[PDB]
């Protein structure tokens, strides 16, 4: 079994990369792809509170992402890993660390302690980081889909750099500045090399 | 202003004590009575998930009590304190520590770290612990099963460990006395604090 998470800011091509990689992996492995809340009812209900929120306090928001994470982990991830599956998860702990911790300003270590309570030692086996420059990311955002948004995008990227710097061995950084066909190939090859080594 | 929390297991006379102590403090203080979620919409929505849940994972439950606590703190407690109010809060951090931490078995220090994230340094100014024996507590519960009895005992045991740990904001009131005396001791303890 393998627990693989995918991380990156907006404009990293993450959605496209995960879907294409997953599609290729389904041929050779017992693999599932998911994201939080992922249809788990308690998680979907927590997510509705987050979306229905009016200027929600960032710590309440962090605690709700962490509660949704646990429900999804407990009801979807853990049962699949117990069946010997490769689990591909779109966003996990590192998303809370970069967005809530770094970009929102709660502090990475504080959001980590919160998330360690939620995951209870279930860290990913491998994390694919879709390493897109802020400039390429910005251009992908305007293309494929104000000024405060630009700075928030940069801080998310800066947040992911600090996370990798403090925990490199868990991470595999993929050049997301390349055309998406190449990002897909590099991500697939990185995963295959990991899966065939275990 | 003052943030005063009330802690204790069921059967400690907590409801009666808070209401009566509120009735006496209002003469001299701008005081409010509250409990989480306390009408805060986001908190009420979180509480509905907790109550509507079926065999919910204890850590998700702990994280939801902590999320409801923050919403209540941010939208009710803090604005009340800013107005100069005495805030009487029925259950706060120590309840998560005794119930989720100790009695449910997650571990007190783990639930503390979770709750320190939620309160972000906003510890109570004073915490009234209504120190009732399990036996007196049990009798008060029946007046107002084996698994329930054992859970009640573990909650009390949990509060003993918490009180043993931190000794500054905690004030232990003998809740084995008749309720009139528990009310008087609690009121006098609060007055001594508010005056000094
Ligand atoms: C998993 C995760 C995601 N994000 C963001 C990634 C980028 C998109 N945002 S968003 O607020 O625009 C958003 C987009 C789609 C959503 O569907 C959403 O709602 C939730 C998603 C997952 C879990 C929960 Cl509780 C809500 C929020 C979420 C965080 O800030 N922290 C996390 O832990
Ligand atoms: C504040 C608090 C209370 N409790 C319990 C105290 C005894 C009663 N229980 S209960 O689960 O039986 C319960 C009774 C009535 C309720 O109304 C309730 O729902 C909530 C109360 C406060 C906050 C939230 Cl999110 C739900 C739960 C909650 C905890 O276990 N942890 C805490 O942090």
Query: Scanning the structure block, which residue is given the tokens 């407690």?
Result: B77
Is the Cβ atom of B100 under 6 angstroms away from ligand 2? Answer: yes
In this structure, what token pair is assigned to residue B192?
A: 């001594």
Distance A18 CA to ligand 1 centre (A): 16
| CATH, residue B122 | 3.40.50.300
Is the Cβ atom of B159 under 6 angstroms away from ligand 2? Answer: no
Which positions ≥6 away from B158 have C-beta within 8 Å?
B97, B98, B99, B101, B102, B103, B108
Distance CA B163, CA B165 (A): 5
Instruction: DSSP letter for A97, please.
Output: I
**Does B45 touch chain A if contact means CB atoms closer than 8 Å?**
yes
Which method was used?
X-ray
In this structure, what token pair is assigned to residue A181?
A: 């066909």
* Resolution at which this structure was determined, Å: 2.0
Q: List the domain range (segments joined by +) for residue B187.
A: 1-196
CB contacts of B53 in chain A (<8 Å) are: 42
How would DSSP label each residue in B74-135? IIIIHHHHHTT-EEEEES-HHHHIIIIIIISSS-HHHHHHHHHHHHTT---SEEEEEE--HH
Q: Which residue in chain A has the smallest CA separation from B42?
A: A49
Cα-Cα-Cα-Cα dihedral sign, residues B92, B98, B101, B107: positive
Number of domains composing chain A = 1
Pick B117's closest partner by Cβ from A46, A71, A114: A114
- Quote the minimal CA–CA distance from B134 to chain A in Å: 30
Pocket perturbation via mutation, ligand 2, pick of B5, B10, B47, B48 by most ligand atoms within 8 A of CB: B47
Which positions ≥6 away from B154 have C-beta within 8 Å?
B102, B103
Query: Scanning the structure block, which residue is given the tokens 């994280």?
Result: B63
């Amino acid at each position: 079994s393998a627990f693989i998470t995918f991380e990156g800011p907006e404009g990293s091509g993450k959605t496209t990369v995960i879907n294409e990689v997953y599609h290729r992996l389904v041929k050779d492995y017992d693999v599932i792809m998911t994201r939080e809340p992922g249809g788990v009812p308690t998680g979907e209900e927590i997510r509705k509170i987050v979306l229905e929120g009016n200027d929600m306090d960032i710590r309440t928001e962090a605690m709700l992402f962490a509660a949704s994470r646990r429900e999804h982990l407990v009801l979807k991830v853990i049962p699949a890993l117990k069946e010997g599956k490769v689990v591909l998860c779109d966003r996990y702990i590192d998303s809370s660390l970069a967005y809530q911790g770094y970009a929102r300003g709660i502090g990475v270590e504080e959001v980590r302690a919160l998330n360690e309570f939620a995951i209870n030692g279930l860290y990913p086996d491998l994390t694919i980081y879709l390493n897109v420059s802020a400039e390429v990311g910005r251009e992908r955002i305007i293309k494929n889909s104000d000024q405060e948004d630009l700075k928030f995008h940069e801080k998310v990227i800066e947040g992911y750099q600090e996370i990798i710097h403090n925990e490199s061995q868990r991470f595999k950084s993929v050049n997301a500045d390349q055309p998406l066909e190449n990002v897909v190939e590099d991500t697939y090859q990185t995963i295959i090399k990991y899966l065939e080594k275990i």
